[PDB]
Design a protein around this ligand. Structure first.
Ligand SMILES: CCCCCCCCCCCCCCCCCC(=O)OC[C@H](COP(=O)([O-])OCC(O)COP(=O)([O-])OC[C@@H](COC(=O)CCCCCCCCCCCCCCCCC)OC(=O)CCCCCCCCCCCCCCCCC)OC(=O)CCCCCCCCCCCCCCCCC
Ligand SMILES: CCCCCCCCCCCCCCCCCC(=O)OC[C@H](COP(=O)([O-])OCC[N+](C)(C)C)OC(=O)CCCCCCCCCCCCCCCCC
Ligand SMILES: CCCCCCCCCCCCCCCCCC(=O)OC[C@H](COP(=O)([O-])OCC[N+](C)(C)C)OC(=O)CCCCCCCCCCCCCCCCC
Ligand SMILES: CCCCCCCCCCCCCCCCCC(=O)OC[C@H](COP(=O)([O-])OCC[N+](C)(C)C)OC(=O)CCCCCCCCCCCCCCCCC
Ligand SMILES: CCCCCCCCCCCCCCCCCC(=O)OC[C@H](COP(=O)(O)OCCN)OC(=O)CCCCCCCCCCCCCCCCC
Ligand SMILES: CCCCCCCCCCCCCCCCCC(=O)OC[C@H](COP(=O)(O)OCCN)OC(=O)CCCCCCCCCCCCCCCCC
Ligand SMILES: CCCCCCCCCCCCCCCCCC(=O)OC[C@H](COP(=O)(O)OCCN)OC(=O)CCCCCCCCCCCCCCCCC
Ligand SMILES: CCCCCCCCCCCCCCCCCC(=O)OC[C@H](COP(=O)(O)OCCN)OC(=O)CCCCCCCCCCCCCCCCC
Ligand SMILES: CCCCCCCCCCCCCCCCCC(=O)OC[C@H](COP(=O)(O)OCCN)OC(=O)CCCCCCCCCCCCCCCCC
Ligand SMILES: CCCCCCCCCCCCCCCCCC(=O)OC[C@H](COP(=O)(O)OCCN)OC(=O)CCCCCCCCCCCCCCCCC
Ligand SMILES: CCCCCCCCCCC1=C(C)C(=O)C(OC)=C(OC)C1=O
Lengths: 105, 169, 57, 48, 110, 314, 347, 98, 80, 70
């Protein structure tokens, strides 16, 4: 029983903390504000059964924003290949990746 | 090594739990939970949770574990193998976790975990002239009206409940 | 557009450097001493810089 | 006394915040060029 | 980082002074002492009142933890709601103190 | 270079605690129509040195401890917390300039009851354990009014930053809008440090009577470090001095004189009153200070709103 | 207890359950469960004897463990979904932890081991609250997360609850433990139809609450906590034996009574989904529940056990107890089967 | 995912299995329960601070307060058990087998 | 209403001061003329960047420059 | 008489004067003759790290004025 008293009486008891894309103090965005807004605007109103299979792309982009698993996997692969080539001596890092370049601004 | 520092604290955090979960005595277990609270506070502080870490000190440690140690010192009158075996079991399982996720930069106990230092997941911007966490806690009085009502009511009722059940009449 | 920002700031500072380099230098030095960089500690150097800019520019 | 002085302190806070606001476009342009510089360097070293 | 250095220095100086205070007079060879309390061997009788004042501390400390973001919460633009909820939290702490009073909870440690 | 700054914080703490014992014996002497120490040094200036050397070669009392580990940890925790309460203190610049230094000090002072509790349980005396439980209950009781008074004052500050509290008091001392908070704060700091008329560890056993002369001296010097620290914190909090940023030593001389006078006011309160009974200072907290503290907390919430005097966040 | 304090504490129990029912944020779900537990603890310690303190300790430990597992399920949902909506969960691990936590709160087997103890340790009114009102909030959370509940887990919990609540009540003579094992079996029946038709879950919950409220109200009106003191009822109040007869024959689910209504409807929804073995074995296992119901009816209504002499004194005094809604609940728990298509009001 | 979450979940499971395997004392059980709460606090905090989800920064404080009130209630129950038997041993709480 | 008040001020002046200060804290912000300025100062404090509007052509109230006349002003704050 | 207590008060007051004087002189020695930069907020740290990057000597306090532009 989801007695939806909040929609019935028009009050807002807990909808404000529900999502990251809601009205925040000082308009502070979440790091995955855009992905969550796109997933919610995709999956709105069509129901959960259609929302699982029709909004899979926005939800996968939003989950990969939240936990950054593919990104950290890619950084693992690049750093591991770099360390292997440093061990083989077939690669040298540039001066701007060794700290000898007098940073931009 | 210093890029892994929060991870290092978390290891000590897990070690601290194998301190009191093995349950040597409730007073040494209280001490282990105090040390665990301090290092978990350090974990919180190193992401930018200054106010939440000082809540771990002031309210969890200085507020609640004081009452745990206080109540415990009024029992268990002052003066094991299962504790020592449980402690070395938990420590060896934790160091096998450390060894696997450092040799592979990836592990999967229940979820997949990266083995890089946890600095990689941060944001590269500024929050201006405010802590975002401070303003989100300040929003408890502006946006959190129902949350304030139910929490303060539960605390008042908790006062009433403790006075009813500790009376025996 | 960002380059235009980085082009229009420099033309801002050159026009300070061509006319009012010394009251500006004294003023940002007094700003620079403070660890919070207070405006309220430096009102007379601010007044000299504002006077010099308002007269010459 | 706290009334007069906290109202002065709010005006000084607004003056500091408007100095920040007047500086934010230059810092935003420099930040954009900073992060695109770093991503292009990471892309070139990923390529090699 | 400077904080961790300062904590390590304070903890190290404390541990050094405790080690000196526990081991500098151990070097003397004074004498072996045989040495064969208001309560003799009676077990510590439990006080309900010390536990009640510690629990009252814990509950008022939780109410204090709720009260702690007020110097930040005064900066909001929903000030009528903020002031209402601040006065409501301090009033509920006062009602907790009044109920702790009137049911004789603050007695013999008043 | 920072390590030099840490040492020039914490070695003068130990020297000031060393000579606070002399100042207490002398001031309590003249208030009791006698002299204090004037034989051992010229004007008694070698009395703390002689007493330190006496206590550090006295025989170890050698107790049978219920726990060896907590018996070691309680002086370590007492001295570590009594030295870390000083690092955010703006005098005029803190060692560690942190954004939440007030809440940091409230937290690290809330942790100080574990030394009392662990030393009481680590002794085998049950009566020492009863005294430790009474001392812990006293301290955690007065921490409530510490936190609420401190919140009600920082409603005029704008933040938890201790250095901002100097900027807050540039036009007037903060004792003028908050003298009832100041007087309940001052008596609450008197009851935090187990200081007379709230010293029931000497009213007729202390929690740390099983310690030898060395470790009990370490507890004693941690207590006096807490006393000087809370007087400095009360000075920063209600009697904030003039600060010229080009001449910081003016603020250092001014807060030093005020903190010395407030520490001597502790010395002068112990030369004036009998002790409370234990229930009487419980009555003082729960039935007198805490209702006024809640009422003044409502007043200092609603007062910057009704006068348009809300302090800035930064 | 002060009657004002009793009213405020029961309103706080109701407030916790209503906050679970109406909230859209998982933190307020957890808060409603915390408020519910915190306020129901003095209801269990109403008489202040060591059995009530033992029962309240066991109840606190099980509900606290379930609250921690609930918050871990919520926090893993926030990991894998970045939000807080009380809806389906976005991880099978969080779904498993939340289903385990709610099974611990309901006392479904194998997390049933607190229910016959705690109900034995507490009075009949607090046992009535624990076996009727304390089911409503976790069944509401199970109602709202059913697109994420594992089928194998919920049916394993269901059949294990039905079998263990069947065998547990066969060995009992204490009435509160009989109602507790009846609770475990009926919660198994409610969760077995949850993923198929949750309207029948609500139907089974409502009919169960009516029948359990009737039996606890009869036990309060006759002041009987054992089988053998319930068997003195015919010599004290012969109408109450008729009422416990028809209500226990209803709780076993014999037609034409209304307690036949839910389980039949449950079978009516489990055979549409091509499950035939499972509701058949459930219905055969419910014969055990009906067996110890028949044991109580043989002790109370259909025979006359020997009474004592002092019963003759109690013949001179009518019952002054407020038997609140007992004729209404007795009529509703027996004669409601001709109104079975009223269940569409629960859709 | 991130590496610190592994340790905070493993801490929750260690405090879980400590809370799910009693030795003798009920106080040690309450300490394991509060270790579970502490690990929930840390895990919620690291997520909410990582995600920059501002409104949920008040969430862990709430998670503290209720549960610490819960801890208070647990301590009170323990004390009542200790006022019946003299000890908080869990084997004394076995009267409800019959 | 007057003998009871002098009685409680004779017996319990701490509590009379407590309830009096609490009553002033409750009722006095609704009677103060300066409660409005607290709101107006908290909304005049620019924490965020004033993200400008695309000039569609018809916005007479939105300035083109900070030193233009139209727009929100803070003369009331400088004067009070 | 009563002024016999003033040598101990003088010693203790010098001992309380040492930490603030020391940290003020160390902050002016470590930061180019100026105060230590107070960075309580991430904008202040952003400006400070920008100063460290535009100084060219990896020191935030070495300030570059109008002489660094053309
Ligand atoms: C809608 C859902 C309603 C749910 C039930 C609400 C009432 C029960 C809950 C509270 C409670 O216990 O109240 C006592 C309860 C009586 O329970 P009791 O004490 O066990 O009864 C013993 C005697 O009645 C005691 O008699 P007495 O000598 O003390 O005085 C006679 C008394 C005097 O009555 C009065 O004084 C009432 C007038 C004043 C009311 C207040 C005015 C202010 O008369 C009655 O109470 C007659 C009983 C009426 C039936 C009660 C149940 C109502 C129907 C519930 C739903 C049934 C649905 C069936 C559907 C089946 C198919 C699905 O109710 C009343 O006293 C008032 C009943 C009013 C019914 C109105 C129905 C329509 C509402 C719209
Ligand atoms: C910074 C705070 C203050 C620091 C501490 C105080 C500064 C001085 C510390 C050293 C003082 C001298 C050593 C400790 C005092 C010895 C007293 C004593 O009874 O000694 C007899 C003891 C034992 O002499 P004994 O053999 O005659 O034993 C007497 C007891 N009977 C006979 C019953 C067995 O002497 C020692 O233990 C000698 C210790 C080392 C001597 C000094 C070495 C250099 C120190 C620098
Ligand atoms: C007892 C409780 C008394 C106070 C109730 C809240 C008063 C208040 O200021 O509410 C306005 C506040 C906030 O309203 P508001 O007008 O500030 O809303 C503007 C929108 N925001 C928040 C985004 C700025 O609360 C509500 O309107 C809804 C929450 C409370 C609803 C009533 C709960 C009653 C519980 C009884 C049990
Ligand atoms: C920070 C720098 C120093 C600050 C000042 C402190 C310096 C003086 C210190 C002197 C030595 C004290 C040693 C310890 C004393 C302990 C005993 C004691 O005093 O107990 C406290 C006593 C206790 O009184 P009591 O216990 O004796 O009284 C009897 C009480 N009953 C009946 C319950 C038994 O007083 C208080 O609690 C008052 C605390 C301070 C109150 C300040 C009120 C300010 C005015 C408010 C407004 C009033 C008007 C009404 C509203 C008008 C609105 C327009
Ligand atoms: C921030 C400031 C902190 C300051 C802290 C210190 C405050 C107090 C300062 C000291 C006050 C005066 C000390 C005088 C000591 C006694 C000197 C004396 O007269 O000693 C006599 C004694 C025997 O002499 P004898 O030759 O036998 O006599 C026969 C003569 N026909 O001979 C002896 O005993 C031998 C000589 C002993 C000399 C000891 C001197 C005192 C030690 C003080 C240590 C601290 C010094 C300051 C540290 C901080 C500044 C660097
Ligand atoms: C290689 C050679 C050295 C070997 C190692 C020794 C290291 C140095 C130790 C200190 C100096 C050695 C001499 C010690 C004192 C001997 C002389 C003495 O006792 O003189 C007595 C004189 C006062 O005369 P008195 O007998 O008291 O008469 C009463 C008045 N009618 O007394 C006085 O006038 C005052 C005497 C003061 C003693 C010195 C000051 C105290 C010690 C300071 C250093 C150690 C402690 C440092 C700080 C510790 C922490 C606070
Ligand atoms: C029985 C065991 C031994 C007992 C004796 C020793 C332990 C007890 C005494 C020491 C207590 C240690 C307290 C450490 C944390 C204190 C809180 C804290 O860090 O606050 C300061 C500050 C927050 O302010 P803010 O300015 O917002 O942050 C900087 C942003 N510019 O934040 C910062 O400046 C952040 C700095 C980086 C993070 C620091 C992390 C410290 C290490 C982890 C905790 C260590 C203590 C663990 C044990 C606790 C006690 C058992
Ligand atoms: C989708 C559904 C959503 C939700 C819908 C509504 C669900 C309602 C669930 C009902 C749960 C009832 C819980 C028990 C009543 C609570 C109040 C209470 O404690 O009453 C007992 C009270 C105690 O009095 P006391 O003096 O302590 O008695 C012991 C002897 N001295 O007094 C007594 O002992 C008096 C004796 C008789 C008490 C009878 C109470 C019956 C209440 C239940 C009625 C049936 C349910 C409502 C109708 C169906 C709704 C689904
Ligand atoms: C499979 C699930 C469990 C995996 C971890 C197992 C860790 C090793 C413990 C195995 C059981 C040992 C044992 O005897 O436990 C019983 C003990 C309570 O019983 P007690 O009365 O102390 O002693 C009588 C002896 N049965 O129980 C205890 O003391 C158990 C305390 C457990 C605390 C967990 C610590 C971390 C363990 C590793 C990570 C999980
Ligand atoms: C509406 C504004 C908000 C109000 C709530 C917030 C208040 C802030 C302060 C918090 C106080 C918390 C504790 C209050 C407990 C009150 C009950 C009480 O103490 O009753 C007992 C007392 C007699 O004391 P006794 O029991 O004998 O104890 C030994 C000491 N003699 O009995 C008494 O002393 C009688 C106490 C009641 C009469 C006090 C009258 C004060 C009137 C001041 C002017 C009006 C102010 C406006 C508010 C309305 C007040 C009624
Ligand atoms: C690191 C050690 C520094 C020196 C020791 C502390 C300073 C000397 C205090 C001596 C003292 C005095 C005067 C004293 O009177 C006293 O008794 C109440 C003590 O406690 C046992 C003391 O420790």
């Amino acid at each position: 029983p989801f007695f939806d008293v909040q929609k019935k009486l028009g009050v807002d008891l807990d909808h404000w903390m529900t999502i990251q894309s809601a009205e925040q103090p000082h308009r502070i965005p979440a790091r995955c504000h855009a992905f969550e807004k796109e997933w919610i605007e995709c999956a709105h109103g069509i129901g959960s059964i259609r929302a699982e299979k029709e909004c899979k792309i926005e939800f996968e982009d939003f989950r990969e924003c939240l936990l950054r698993q593919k990104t950290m996997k890619r950084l693992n692969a690049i750093k591991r290949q770099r360390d292997k080539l440093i061990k083989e001596g077939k690669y040298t890092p540039p001066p701007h990746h060794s700290g000898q370049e007098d940073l931009r601004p | 090594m210093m890029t892994y520092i929060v991870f290092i604290l978390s290891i000590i955090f897990v070690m601290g739990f194998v301190g009191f979960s093995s349950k040597p005595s409730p007073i040494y277990g209280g001490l282990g939970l105090i040390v665990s609270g301090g290092v978990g506070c350090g974990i919180v502080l190193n992401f930018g949770g200054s106010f939440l870490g000082l809540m771990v000190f002031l309210i969890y440690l200085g507020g609640m574990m004081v009452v745990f140690g206080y109540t415990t010192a009024m029992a268990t009158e002052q003066y094991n193998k299962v504790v020592l075996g449980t402690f070395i079991t938990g420590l060896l399982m934790e160091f096998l976790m450390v060894y696997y996720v450092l040799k592979d930069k990836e592990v999967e106990i229940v979820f997949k975990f990266n083995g890089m230092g946890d600095w990689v997941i941060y944001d590269t911007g500024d929050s201006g002239f405010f802590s975002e966490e401070a303003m989100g806690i300040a929003a408890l009085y502006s946006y959190g009206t129902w949350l304030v009502i139910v929490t303060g009511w539960s605390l008042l009722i908790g006062v009433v409940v403790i006075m009813e059940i500790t009376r025996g009449n | 557009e960002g380059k235009l920002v980085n082009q229009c700031a420099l033309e801002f500072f050159r026009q300070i450097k061509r006319h009012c380099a010394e009251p500006f230098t004294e003023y940002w030095t007094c700003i620079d001493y403070s660890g919070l960089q207070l405006f309220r500690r430096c009102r007379k150097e601010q007044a000299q810089f504002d006077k010099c800019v308002l007269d010459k520019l | 006394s706290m009334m007069r002085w906290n109202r002065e302190r709010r005006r000084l806070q607004i003056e500091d915040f408007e100095a920040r606001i007047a500086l934010m476009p230059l810092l935003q342009a420099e930040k954009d060029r900073r992060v695109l510089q770093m991503l292009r360097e990471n892309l070139e070293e990923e390529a090699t | 980082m400077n904080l961790m250095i300062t904590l390590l220095t304070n903890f190290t100086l404390a541990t050094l002074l405790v080690t000196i205070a526990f081991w500098l007079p151990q070097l003397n060879v004074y004498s072996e002492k045989t040495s064969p309390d208001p309560m003799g061997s009676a077990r510590l009788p439990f006080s309900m009142k010390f536990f009640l004042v510690a629990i009252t501390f814990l509950l008022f400390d939780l109410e204090i933890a709720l009260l702690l973001p007020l110097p930040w919460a005064s900066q909001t633009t929903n000030l009528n709601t903020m002031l209402t909820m601040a006065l409501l939290l301090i009033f509920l702490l006062a009602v907790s103190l009044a109920y702790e009073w009137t049911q004789k909870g603050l007695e013999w440690t008043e | 270079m920072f390590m030099i700054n840490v040492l020039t914080l914490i070695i003068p703490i130990l020297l000031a605690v060393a000579f606070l014992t002399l100042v207490e014996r002398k001031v309590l002497g003249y208030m009791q129509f006698r002299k204090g120490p004037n034989v051992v040094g010229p004007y008694g200036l070698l009395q703390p040195i002689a007493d330190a050397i006496k206590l550090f070669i006295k025989e170890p009392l050698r107790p049978a401890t219920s726990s060896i580990s907590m018996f070691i940890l309680a002086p370590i925790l007492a001295l570590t917390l009594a030295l870390t309460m000083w690092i955010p203190l703006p005098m005029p610049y803190p060692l560690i300039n942190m954004n939440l230094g007030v809440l940091f000090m409230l937290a690290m002072s809330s942790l100080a009851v574990y030394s009392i509790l662990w030393s009481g349980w680590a002794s085998n005396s049950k009566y020492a354990l009863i005294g430790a439980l009474r001392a812990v209950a006293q301290t955690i009781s007065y921490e409530v009014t510490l936190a609420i008074i401190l919140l009600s004052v920082l409603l005029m500050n704008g933040s938890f930053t201790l250095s901002t509290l100097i900027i807050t008091q540039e036009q007037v001392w903060l004792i003028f809008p908050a003298w009832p908070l100041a007087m309940m704060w001052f008596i609450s700091t008197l009851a935090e440090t187990n200081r007379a008329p709230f010293d029931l560890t000497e009213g007729e056993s202390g929690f740390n009577v099983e310690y030898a002369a060395g470790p009990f001296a370490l507890f004693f010097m941690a207590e006096y470090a807490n006393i000087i620290m809370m007087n400095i914190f009360t000075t920063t909090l209600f009697l904030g001095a003039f600060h010229n940023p080009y001449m910081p030593e003016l603020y250092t001389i001014n807060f030093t004189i005020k903190s010395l006078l407030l520490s001597i006011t502790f010395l002068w309160i112990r030369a004036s009153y009998p002790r409370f009974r234990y229930d009487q200072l419980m009555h003082l907290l729960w039935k007198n200070f805490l209702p006024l503290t809640l009422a003044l907390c409502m007043w200092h919430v609603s007062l910057p709103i009704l006068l348009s005097s809300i302090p800035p966040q930064t | 207890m002060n009657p004002i304090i009793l009213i405020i504490i029961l309103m706080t129990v109701m407030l916790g359950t209503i906050i679970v029912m109406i909230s859209t944020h998982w933190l307020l779900i957890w808060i409603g469960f915390e408020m519910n537990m915190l306020a129901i603890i003095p209801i269990m310690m109403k008489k202040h004897n060591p059995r009530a303190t033992e029962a309240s300790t066991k109840y606190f430990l099980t509900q606290s463990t379930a609250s921690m597992l609930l918050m871990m399920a919520i926090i893993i949902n926030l990991m894998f979904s970045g939000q807080w909506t009380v809806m389906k969960l976005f991880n099978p691990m969080a779904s498993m932890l939340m289903t385990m936590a709610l099974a611990m709160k309901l006392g479904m087997a194998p997390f049933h081991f607190w229910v016959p103890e705690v109900t034995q340790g507490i009075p009949l009114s607090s046992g009535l609250i624990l076996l009727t009102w304390q089911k409503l909030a976790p069944m509401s959370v199970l109602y709202q997360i059913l697109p994420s509940i594992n089928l194998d887990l919920i049916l394993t919990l269901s059949i294990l609850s039905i079998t263990i609540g069947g065998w547990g009540g066969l060995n009992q003579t204490q009435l509160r433990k009989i109602m507790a094992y009846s609770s475990i079996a009926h919660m198994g029946w409610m969760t077995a139809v949850l993923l198929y038709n949750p309207t029948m879950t609500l139907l089974n919950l409502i009919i169960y609450i009516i029948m359990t409220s009737t039996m606890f109200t009869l036990f309060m009106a006759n002041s009987t906590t054992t089988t053998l003191s319930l068997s003195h009822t015919w010599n004290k109040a012969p109408i109450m034996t008729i009422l416990v007869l028809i209500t226990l024959l209803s709780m076993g689910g014999l037609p034409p009574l209304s307690g036949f209504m839910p389980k039949w409807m449950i079978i009516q929804e489990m055979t549409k989904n091509d499950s035939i073995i499972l509701p058949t074995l459930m219905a055969i296992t419910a014969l055990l529940n009906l067996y110890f119901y028949m044991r109580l009816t043989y002790s109370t209504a259909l025979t006359m056990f020997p009474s004592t002499n002092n019963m003759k004194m109690k013949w001179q005094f009518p019952t002054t107890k407020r038997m609140t809604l007992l004729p209404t609940m007795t009529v509703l728990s027996t004669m409601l089967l001709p109104l079975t298509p009223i269940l569409s009001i629960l859709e | 995912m991130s590496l610190v979450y592994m340790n905070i979940m493993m801490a929750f499971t260690v405090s879980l299995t400590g809370l799910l395997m009693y030795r003798s004392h009920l106080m040690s059980s309450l300490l394991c329960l509060e270790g579970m709460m502490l690990s929930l606090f840390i895990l919620a905090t690291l997520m909410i601070l990582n995600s920059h989800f501002t409104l949920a920064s008040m969430m862990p404080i709430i998670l503290l307060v209720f549960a610490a009130c819960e801890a208070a209630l647990g301590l009170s129950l323990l004390v009542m058990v200790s006022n019946t038997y003299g000890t908080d041993y869990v084997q004394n709480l076995n009267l409800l087998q019959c | 209403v007057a003998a009871f008040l002098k009685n409680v001020w004779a017996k319990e002046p701490v509590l009379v001061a407590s309830f009096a200060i609490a009553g002033l804290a409750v009722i006095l912000p609704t009677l103060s003329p300066y409660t409005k300025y607290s709101l107006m100062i908290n909304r005049a404090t620019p924490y965020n960047y004033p993200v400008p509007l695309r000039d569609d052509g018809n916005m007479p109230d939105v300035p083109s420059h900070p030193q233009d006349p139209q727009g929100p002003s803070l003369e009331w704050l400088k004067r009070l | 008489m009563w002024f016999e207590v003033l040598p101990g008060i003088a010693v203790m007051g010098v001992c309380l004067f040492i930490p603030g004087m020391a940290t003020a002189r160390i902050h002016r020695f470590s930061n180019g003759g100026r105060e230590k930069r107070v960075a309580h907020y991430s904008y202040q740290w952003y400006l400070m790290e920008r100063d460290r990057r535009v100084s060219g000597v990896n020191r935030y306090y070495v300030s570059k004025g109008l002489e660094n532009i053309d």
